[PDB]
Amino acid sequence: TAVALGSFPLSLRLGEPLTIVSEDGDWWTVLSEVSGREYNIPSVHVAKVSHGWLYEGLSREKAEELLLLPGNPGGAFLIRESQTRRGSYSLSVRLSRPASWDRIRHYRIHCLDNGWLYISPRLTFPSLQALVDHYSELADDICCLLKEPCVL
């Protein structure tokens, strides 16, 4: 349901799966699902996850960090809500055999004022689930077929 984003403060690290115990303002209480240890951490150091690939509070930079962890093949992907906008998202997908200076490709997921979502205006979707479904099988309009969700 949640993931640690950085070193804190024997310690948590990026990608570590979490269980949220309390959300008291900008400080959350979490449990690591590998060590069981309890942590009192700033909310900004944690990302919420739903649908196995939908992240909240995950920056563009931290998304690259997550996707670039070992064990993520080419096509590994996630969707992250914009930290600037509302129901606006970005698709981040690991590139296959990339050069070191461009290993991750980000696509804006446009949401019209009508609530439908798309990367290419020719192909619109009623939900992120429908979008991921589609691009897991057909992805000619983008760089990469969506293979697997980012590890954890």
From Swiss-Prot:
Q: Which GO biological-process labels does this protein carry?
A: antigen receptor-mediated signaling pathway; B cell mediated immunity; negative regulation of calcium-mediated signaling; negative regulation of T cell receptor signaling pathway; negative regulation of transcription by RNA polymerase II; regulation of immune response; T cell activation
> Could you confirm whether the keyword Cell membrane appears in this record?
yes
Molecular function (Gene Ontology), one example: signaling adaptor activity
User: Which residues fall in a coiled-coil region?
Assistant: none
Describe its assembly: Interacts (via SH2 domain) with ZAP70 (phosphorylated) and CD3Z (phosphorylated). Interacts (via SH2 domain) with CSF1R (phosphorylated). Interacts (via its C-terminal domain) with CBL (phosphorylated).
Q: What does this protein do?
A: Adapter protein, which negatively regulates T-cell receptor (TCR) signaling. Inhibits T-cell antigen-receptor induced activation of nuclear factor of activated T-cells. May act by linking signaling proteins such as ZAP70 with CBL, leading to a CBL dependent degradation of signaling proteins.
Q: What is known of its domains?
A: The loss of the C-terminal domain partially abolishes the inhibitory function, but can be partially compensated by higher level of protein expression.
Q: What is this protein called?
A: Src-like-adapter 2
Which organism was this protein described from? Homo sapiens
Q: What is the lineage of its organism?
A: Eukaryota, Metazoa, Chordata, Craniata, Vertebrata
